[PDB]
Enzyme design. Structure first.
Site, PDB file in Angstrom:
ATOM      1  CG  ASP A 163      -0.617  58.914 -17.984  1.00  0.00           C
ATOM      2  OD1 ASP A 163      -0.921  60.114 -18.142  1.00  0.00           O
ATOM      3  OD2 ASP A 163       0.445  58.402 -18.429  1.00  0.00           O
ATOM      4  CG  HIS A 190       8.204  59.637 -22.445  1.00  0.00           C
ATOM      5  ND1 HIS A 190       8.393  60.491 -21.378  1.00  0.00           N
ATOM      6  CD2 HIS A 190       7.089  58.916 -22.165  1.00  0.00           C
ATOM      7  CE1 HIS A 190       7.424  60.305 -20.492  1.00  0.00           C
ATOM      8  NE2 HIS A 190       6.626  59.345 -20.941  1.00  0.00           N
ATOM      9  CG  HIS A 241       4.520  59.347 -17.269  1.00  0.00           C
ATOM     10  ND1 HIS A 241       3.334  58.748 -17.669  1.00  0.00           N
ATOM     11  CD2 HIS A 241       5.038  58.554 -16.300  1.00  0.00           C
ATOM     12  CE1 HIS A 241       3.147  57.647 -16.956  1.00  0.00           C
ATOM     13  NE2 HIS A 241       4.165  57.507 -16.121  1.00  0.00           N
ATOM     14  CG  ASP A 283       1.117  61.529 -20.244  1.00  0.00           C
ATOM     15  OD1 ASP A 283       1.967  61.133 -19.418  1.00  0.00           O
ATOM     16  OD2 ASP A 283       0.489  60.737 -20.983  1.00  0.00           O
ATOM     17  CD  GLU A 289      10.315  52.292 -20.772  1.00  0.00           C
ATOM     18  OE1 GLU A 289      11.074  52.571 -19.826  1.00  0.00           O
ATOM     19  OE2 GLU A 289      10.314  52.911 -21.853  1.00  0.00           O
ATOM     20  CE1 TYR A 340       5.705  48.583 -13.871  1.00  0.00           C
ATOM     21  CE2 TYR A 340       4.760  46.428 -13.487  1.00  0.00           C
ATOM     22  CZ  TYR A 340       4.887  47.755 -13.149  1.00  0.00           C
ATOM     23  OH  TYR A 340       4.195  48.256 -12.070  1.00  0.00           O
ATOM     24  CD  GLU A 373      24.828  44.572 -27.375  1.00  0.00           C
ATOM     25  OE1 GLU A 373      24.209  43.480 -27.383  1.00  0.00           O
ATOM     26  OE2 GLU A 373      26.013  44.692 -26.947  1.00  0.00           O
ATOM     27  CE1 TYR A 393       0.213  55.120 -19.710  1.00  0.00           C
ATOM     28  CE2 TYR A 393      -0.021  53.570 -21.540  1.00  0.00           C
ATOM     29  CZ  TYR A 393       0.539  54.712 -20.988  1.00  0.00           C
ATOM     30  OH  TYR A 393       1.429  55.453 -21.732  1.00  0.00           O
TER      31      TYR A 393
HETATM   32  N1  FKS Z   1      25.909  41.233 -27.612  1.00  0.00           N
HETATM   33  C1  FKS Z   1      26.925  41.569 -26.625  1.00  0.00           C
HETATM   34  C2  FKS Z   1      26.290  41.558 -25.241  1.00  0.00           C
HETATM   35  C3  FKS Z   1      27.286  42.010 -24.178  1.00  0.00           C
HETATM   36  N2  FKS Z   1      26.697  41.944 -22.846  1.00  0.00           N
HETATM   37  C4  FKS Z   1      27.516  42.283 -21.687  1.00  0.00           C
HETATM   38  C5  FKS Z   1      28.887  41.597 -21.659  1.00  0.00           C
HETATM   39  C6  FKS Z   1      29.593  41.960 -20.359  1.00  0.00           C
HETATM   40  C7  FKS Z   1      31.004  41.386 -20.379  1.00  0.00           C
HETATM   41  C8  FKS Z   1      31.612  41.428 -18.977  1.00  0.00           C
HETATM   42  C9  FKS Z   1      33.140  41.222 -18.875  1.00  0.00           C
HETATM   43  O1  FKS Z   1      33.536  40.031 -19.518  1.00  0.00           O
HETATM   44  O2  FKS Z   1      33.858  42.283 -19.522  1.00  0.00           O
HETATM   45  C10 FKS Z   1      33.597  41.162 -17.422  1.00  0.00           C
HETATM   46  F1  FKS Z   1      34.926  41.129 -17.377  1.00  0.00           F
HETATM   47  F2  FKS Z   1      33.205  42.220 -16.757  1.00  0.00           F
HETATM   48  F3  FKS Z   1      33.153  40.081 -16.804  1.00  0.00           F
HETATM   49  N1  FKS Z   2       7.288  52.027 -12.508  1.00  0.00           N
HETATM   50  C1  FKS Z   2       7.070  53.075 -13.494  1.00  0.00           C
HETATM   51  C2  FKS Z   2       7.286  52.491 -14.886  1.00  0.00           C
HETATM   52  C3  FKS Z   2       7.148  53.551 -15.974  1.00  0.00           C
HETATM   53  N2  FKS Z   2       7.358  52.978 -17.302  1.00  0.00           N
HETATM   54  C4  FKS Z   2       7.257  53.815 -18.491  1.00  0.00           C
HETATM   55  C5  FKS Z   2       5.966  54.642 -18.508  1.00  0.00           C
HETATM   56  C6  FKS Z   2       5.894  55.402 -19.829  1.00  0.00           C
HETATM   57  C7  FKS Z   2       4.666  56.317 -19.820  1.00  0.00           C
HETATM   58  C8  FKS Z   2       4.344  56.765 -21.245  1.00  0.00           C
HETATM   59  C9  FKS Z   2       3.406  57.983 -21.360  1.00  0.00           C
HETATM   60  O1  FKS Z   2       2.184  57.733 -20.697  1.00  0.00           O
HETATM   61  O2  FKS Z   2       3.982  59.150 -20.755  1.00  0.00           O
HETATM   62  C10 FKS Z   2       3.118  58.310 -22.810  1.00  0.00           C
HETATM   63  F1  FKS Z   2       2.385  59.432 -22.859  1.00  0.00           F
HETATM   64  F2  FKS Z   2       4.221  58.489 -23.504  1.00  0.00           F
HETATM   65  F3  FKS Z   2       2.424  57.366 -23.389  1.00  0.00           F
HETATM   66  K     K Z   3       3.085  66.099 -18.367  1.00  0.00           K
HETATM   67 ZN    ZN Z   4       2.071  59.128 -19.256  1.00  0.00          ZN
END
Ligand code: FKS
Ligand code: FKS
Ligand code: K
Ligand code: ZN
Ligand code: K
Ligand code: NA
Ligand code: NA
Ligand code: ZN
Lengths: 341, 341
Positions: free
Chosen positions: B284, B159, B197, B195, B117, B19, B106, B323
């Site tokens: 919320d 969501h 959202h 809600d 988030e 956040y 990943e 919240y």
């Molecule tokens: N666990 C794997 C995590 C990978 N995280 C992002 C890696 C970005 C690589 C960037 C790059 O090397 O391709 C560039 F040429 F753009 F610099």
């Molecule tokens: N700056 C804005 C940040 C917003 N971050 C994610 C908020 C998720 C809300 C979840 C929800 O309230 O909709 C649920 F009902 F699913 F719980």
């Molecule tokens: K809603």
């Molecule tokens: Zn919500």
């Protein structure tokens, strides 16, 4: 050859990267440029020159204008919204989303992002413009008749697509260089991406364009970043049909295998008739690289540079990735030795 | 009315949420359920029962099997890969990506995520299944003839889309409840999402289905999470034509305006011929909510519950967001007072 390098890379000095569920110091940090510059000088490439500044004429032909406007003010807007950390995207326009562009900073940072590990920090835009300028000046040397030049770009560029930043990249330097060569009179240009990671940004930019051929050797996207492009089946569409060539390779790949893909990519480029090749050079293919799974050795970089230069067409070498160890410098310098030898 | 609640919600007790570019304690924390349960009991709704456990037969009709398989092992795979933090996606299948599914953790966590988030933590899958069970048992009470029931779900659900988690949500409890009512004999069911959202997950699940009508009142996606769905123009597709009704509203919206959208949504639901309404209840929308921009007051929740129950059709109330302050409990209890009064 000339080495184009801006000290303004240092304006990108982000505090954080989201890696393994933690906010850690970034892999793509200013020390990389320091190590690479020192090693190229040590290898005798000491004709180092700052780029002239450039405006947006070239880059507007490869990146969306809204995207560039977003990058220009992203940090200011994030800070004004009262957020305490660096600017990191959360929500993304994934499957079955609206194509609409949000108006606020949180929505827009996600709209314009492909990868959340990359934080926008103060100075990022200015650094990205300096890195673009190094690529442009490198391209201008090739257009003026030089057969080799090295643009020591930082931040890197090849994950930046038409309208999205990510993977440590904001402006696609190699794409801008290719465009600059076309603008100076070339009709056909290739980009050869030898960084460990797929150049998904570069592929995006030129996927539907027949004036640029894009070849990439990279970790298989089934199990490597960027995860969502880079399969062999992606060969281009529309006017760009047949002008993307992806060579995904697996864990532990050594030069004996990687070099076979290199040979094939150069055959493809020659058959396309490239008038010059922009080489997106990352040295994260090295056996010690901390985030990558290929097994190239330092001597292999000399072989690589020699083989690419044996194409007999001019090369602009554009710096991309390569992490962790000071050998990143030796490895880049070795590519230049192969080109120059 | 019966209140269905599982103590197994506590198995989701994540330490981090991304956040404002920081990793902070999550807003969607176990204490929310404690606050809500205490307030509903205080208001006289003390017929609290644990749900029976359920397998996957109902949920497989609204979520993709590969998605559910991914959630079941995500934590274990993340830990086995050596990452030190909780499981947080970084790379996402955004514009112009391959549709292919990665094989690694990943790649897969990004493939299956719409919002970074939300971290996956140990116990998340087990907690999500318990929350789904509370929704299923609530639905079963409505199917058996009760005119109201409250499923105190945590984690929340709206969501979570066909094959995506995010926004604190993993299994779309309301969608599973609607499916359960259809399986028990209903032909047409509505989900009314109050809600703050947008219920982008719920919209996704039923967008092309004519057996469920989805109405949502929410912060405008141009300037509110989830940002990439929830515009008024989205009305359905294919078999689901005309069965999505979005009511985006702006900063500071009070009940005098919000209630007009409520009235219209209920008119739409009545014309559709819903046999029951699953209410995705988040509080919320409250004027003190820390992440939201509507201005409902605690008394407004009684009005809301009365108005929805005046539909004259059975209601399942399914807990979503709200919240920050213990008054979330008062606000939920007030909806129940309006329903029961
Ligand atoms: N666990 C794997 C995590 C990978 N995280 C992002 C890696 C970005 C690589 C960037 C790059 O090397 O391709 C560039 F040429 F753009 F610099
Ligand atoms: N700056 C804005 C940040 C917003 N971050 C994610 C908020 C998720 C809300 C979840 C929800 O309230 O909709 C649920 F009902 F699913 F719980
Ligand atoms: K809603
Ligand atoms: Zn919500
Ligand atoms: K590559
Ligand atoms: Na092309
Ligand atoms: Na529908
Ligand atoms: Zn790389």
């Amino acid at each position: 050859m000339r080495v184009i390098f801006s000290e303004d890379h240092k304006l990108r000095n982000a505090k954080t990267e989201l890696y393994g569920g933690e906010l850690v110091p970034p892999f793509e940090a200013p020390f990389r440029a320091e190590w690479i510059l020192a090693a190229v000088k040590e290898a005798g490439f000491d004709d180092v020159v700052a780029p002239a500044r450039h405006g947006l004429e070239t880059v507007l032909k490869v990146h969306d204008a809204g995207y560039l406007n977003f990058l220009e003010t992203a940090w200011d807007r994030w800070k004004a919204a009262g957020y305490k950390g660096e600017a990191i995207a959360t929500s993304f326009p994934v499957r079955r989303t609206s194509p609409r562009i949000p108006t606020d900073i949180e929505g827009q940072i996600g709209y314009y992002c492909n990868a959340a590990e990359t934080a926008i920090s103060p100075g990022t835009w200015e650094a990205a413009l300096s890195s673009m300028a190094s690529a442009i000046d490198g391209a201008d040397l090739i257009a003026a008749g030089h057969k080799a030049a090295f643009s020591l770009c930082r931040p890197p560029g090849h994950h930046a697509g038409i309208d999205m930043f990510g993977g440590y990249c904001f402006i696609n330097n190699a794409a801008v260089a290719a465009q600059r060569l076309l603008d100076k009179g070339a009709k056909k240009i290739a980009i050869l991406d030898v960084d460990f990671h797929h150049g998904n940004g570069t592929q995006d930019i030129f996927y539907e364009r027949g004036d640029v051929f894009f070849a990439s050797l990279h970790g298989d996207p089934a199990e490597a970043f960027p995860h969502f492009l880079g399969y062999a089946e992606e060969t281009g569409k529309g006017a760009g049909a047949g002008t993307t060539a992806n060579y995904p390779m697996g864990r532990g790949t050594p030069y004996s295998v990687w070099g076979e893909a290199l040979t094939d990519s150069l055959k493809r480029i020659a058959a396309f008739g490239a008038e010059a090749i922009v080489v997106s050079l990352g040295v994260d293919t090295f056996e010690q690289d901390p985030i990558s799974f290929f097994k190239l050795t330092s001597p292999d970089y000399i072989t690589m540079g020699r083989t690419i230069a044996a194409s007999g067409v001019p090369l602009l070498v554009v710096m991309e990735g390569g992490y962790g160890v000071p050998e990143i410098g030796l490895n880049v310098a070795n590519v230049l030795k192969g080109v120059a030898g």
